[PDB]
Amino acid sequence: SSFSFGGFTFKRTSGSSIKREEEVLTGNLQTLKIRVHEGYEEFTMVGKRATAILRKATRRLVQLIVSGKDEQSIAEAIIVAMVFSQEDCMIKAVRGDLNFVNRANQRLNPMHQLLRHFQKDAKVLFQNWGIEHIDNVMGMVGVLPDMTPSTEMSMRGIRVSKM
Ligand SMILES: C[C@H](Nc1nc(-c2c[nH]c3ncc(Cl)cc23)ncc1F)C(=O)N(C)C
């Protein structure tokens, strides 16, 4: 529909999805109960410092083309997208405990807890997502897990566009 997550306005342009509660295992073998969105969808993510076009299948980011003000703003959109995708490699990239016990995390649904976790440090998220060789498309660049640009390789399904 039209909703917000991690500071971005999401607007669905194609497809549809249904919700099914599912148990997932983190890289720390912690069980999380998440509402999995099933179905292929395309979205525009609109933020104050970055915008993107997201194509996602059930628990699988297919493509993310992002533009933004700078490396940091772009990385923020990428993190929000990777979390939003509900991919297994993102869930498995959680390597410590996801505290649901403490007073401050009570109002946090799993997806929002995952988001907070990766926003604190996205190093393992980016390093475990995977890289691919990229085809040459002008006006688009690949981005390595350290957010340095490359015309050779990129984080899987991720491309950076010029503003
Ligand atoms: C705020 C968002 N609200 C909505 N999310 C979705 C949605 C569609 N496909 C998705 N895929 C993944 C996730 Cl994660 C959420 C969605 N649709 C309508 C919404 F109000 C939400 O519930 N989460 C990010 C968990």
UniProtKB/Swiss-Prot annotation:
Record localization: Virion; Host nucleus; Host mitochondrion
Function recorded in the entry: Plays an essential role in transcription initiation and cap-stealing mechanism, in which cellular capped pre-mRNAs are used to generate primers for viral transcription. Recognizes and binds the 7-methylguanosine-containing cap of the target pre-RNA which is subsequently cleaved after 10-13 nucleotides by the viral protein PA. Plays a role in the initiation of the viral genome replication and modulates the activity of the ribonucleoprotein (RNP) complex.
Subunit details: Influenza RNA polymerase is composed of three subunits: PB1, PB2 and PA. Interacts (via N-terminus) with PB1 (via C-terminus). Interacts with nucleoprotein NP (via N-terminus). Interacts (via N-terminus) with host MAVS (via N-terminus); this interaction inhibits host innate immune response.
Family recorded in the similarity comment: Belongs to the influenza viruses PB2 family.
Name of the protein this chain belongs to: Polymerase basic protein 2
Species classification: Viruses, Riboviria, Orthornavirae, Negarnaviricota, Polyploviricotina
Included stretch of the parent chain: 321 to 483 of 759
